[PDB]
From Swiss-Prot:
The chain holds residues 2693 to 2720 of 3907 of the full protein. It is found in: Host membrane. It comes from Bovine viral diarrhea virus (strain CP7) (BVDV). It comes from the Viruses. It is a peripheral membrane protein. The lineage of its organism: Viruses, Riboviria, Orthornavirae, Kitrinoviricota, Flasuviricetes. This is Non-structural protein 5A.
Amino acid sequence: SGNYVLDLIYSLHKQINRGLKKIVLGWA
């Protein structure tokens, strides 16, 4: 408890955002 279970889910959110950025915005 105490701001928990939310930050762990966002840890993956950044991996998807940065994962689909250098390869997605790098081949246009």
